[PDB]
From a paper:
Sugars and other sweet-tasting compounds are detected by the sweet taste receptor, a member of the class C GPCR family. The sweet receptor is a heterodimer composed of TAS1R2 and TAS1R3,3,4 two type 1 taste receptor family members that share the distinctive architecture of class C GPCRs: a large extracellular Venus flytrap (VFT) domain, responsible for ligand recognition; a cysteine-rich domain (CRD); and a seven-transmembrane (7TM) domain that mediates G protein coupling. To address this gap, here we present cryo-electron microscopy (cryo-EM) structures of the sweet receptor in the inactive, unliganded state, as well as in the activated, sucralose- and advantame-bound states. Unlike other class C GPCRs, such as mGluR, CaSR and GABAB receptors, where agonists stabilize inter-subunit VFT interactions to promote activation, the sweet receptor is activated by the rearrangement of a TAS1R2 VFT loop, which destabilizes interactions between the lower VFT lobes and the VFT–CRD interfaces.
We first determined the structure of the human/mouse sweet receptor in the absence of sweeteners. To improve the resolution, we combined all particles to generate a global reconstruction at 3.1 Å resolution, then performed local refinement focused on the VFT/CRD region or the 7TM domain, obtaining final resolutions of 2.9 Å and 3.6 Å, respectively. While the orientation between extracellular and transmembrane domains can vary, each domain remains nearly identical across individual classes. In our apo sweet receptor structure, the two subunits pack closely against each other at both the upper and lower lobes of the VFT domains, as well as at the 7TM domains. In the apo state, the 7TM domains of TAS1R2 and TAS1R3 interact through two interfaces, a configuration that is markedly different from that seen in other apo-state class C GPCRs.
Author numbering:
A (entry chain B): 561 to 835
B (entry chain A): 554 to 831
Amino acid sequence: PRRPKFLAWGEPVVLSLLLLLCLVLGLALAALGLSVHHWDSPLVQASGGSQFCFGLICLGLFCLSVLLFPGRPSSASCLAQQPMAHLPLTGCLSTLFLQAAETFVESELPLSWANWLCSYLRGLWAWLVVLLATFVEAALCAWYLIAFPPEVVTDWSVLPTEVLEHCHVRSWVSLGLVHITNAMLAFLCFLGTFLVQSQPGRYNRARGLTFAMLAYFITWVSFVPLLANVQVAYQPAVQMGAILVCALGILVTFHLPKCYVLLWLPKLNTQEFFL
Amino acid sequence: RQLVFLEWHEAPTIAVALLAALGFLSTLAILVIFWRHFQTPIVRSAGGPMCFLMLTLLLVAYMVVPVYVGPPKVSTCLCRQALFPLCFTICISCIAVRSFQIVCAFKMASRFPRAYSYWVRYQGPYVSMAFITVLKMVIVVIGMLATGLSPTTRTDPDDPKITIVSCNPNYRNSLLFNTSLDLLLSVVGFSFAYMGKELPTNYNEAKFITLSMTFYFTSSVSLCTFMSAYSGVLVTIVDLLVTVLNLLAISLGYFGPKCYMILFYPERNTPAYFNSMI
């Protein structure tokens, strides 16, 4: 007789990803701790102050979202899987988009427009931009959960002696409805930074932003063919891996080197070098 | 069963046609703005008549859509397979050559003149463009006349009542062997242009080459991923959308800044100013 099949808590494919989750979340919260301890210093203020902390928190939630994929499916899990990941991801990426906006405006624009426009990339209006991005993401997710909601599917035939239960996406083309906003924010962030030229004797945000978006796009380009090719039993594993590796790609590339400067090289944390 | 091919009633078909119309009209505007200012530094530094050749090729390439749409014939097979893609590759080759010239020439002259003078003399630039041109042309001819000049059809994978009509058998493989040479050219031009990001030599066009090659690279990778993960009816219009987006990525992404400066920074078109950039 047939037995059900799904990613089990304790299967090595799940444990090896939970350890990765532990590493990524620990790094994110350690970076937040260093940020809180050095809250007032130039390296934090030049990162938008509380914007830095909020981005790290959004990344932490983005990482914690993976706990919905493995285990016995349920309708709530099926509907929650994608939004619970990509909404915090928008909340994170919008802050990097603001950093890219600053670094672009202050390097590739006439000085009058630079000194005018820069005022609206700080304070209340920066939170306005973040809130707008989050609202658009939520609206497209509300569209997704009505036009293309996934379902718990029991598939008796695709395995030789087992029953597959999986959160069936109706079609991959429908899954872009939740990706598009984050992807466009990432692409704009990349274009805003990847061609900047560094002034001598000062910090260079553009390289960090550029490499972070490059890792993002590498991850999500690799994600598609893996999802297409992998055995039907392990697509949740691919989705979890993509989420965690994307979070790691951002974390190791943008926040972590600032933490390293705080720890090893505090002599650089000066008004002249960062501001 | 029922045959399927692009037609003017469809929402995505008319959307792509409108996008192509925008591209064609903008390219024509570029060409005429150039023609009036034919005697001035911004266009003379662009190589003059070569840019009009390139813009004519782009104008012709934008004419693809009315030939791409509708029930195919052998002539439309030739058009879809060879005639327009070759027009695209010709342009990309010239962009790559200019990217090489801008950044590498002075260094090579200072460091390897005894070898580089072989490229300086004879007709080095035209030689490179012609070599790449015939390479792409012969590859295209081999593929097309091997796979056939008649239309091809397949059964839809999830609504088998409809059969899909196209001109490129084994679509993913055909696109791979079509676009590999263009990817090589893209990477080479991007490398040289990025190494040239600081240089003003010809109104900073290394920066715009970098931008346009980025717009081409992302679209090419997106198309390859999509074809690696989808097989339904949409393929034969996603390919067209990507083609039009590439033609835009060139027509706007490389020429637009030049005409923008012609219109709104005419002071920089003065020879006394150009002498500070040359």
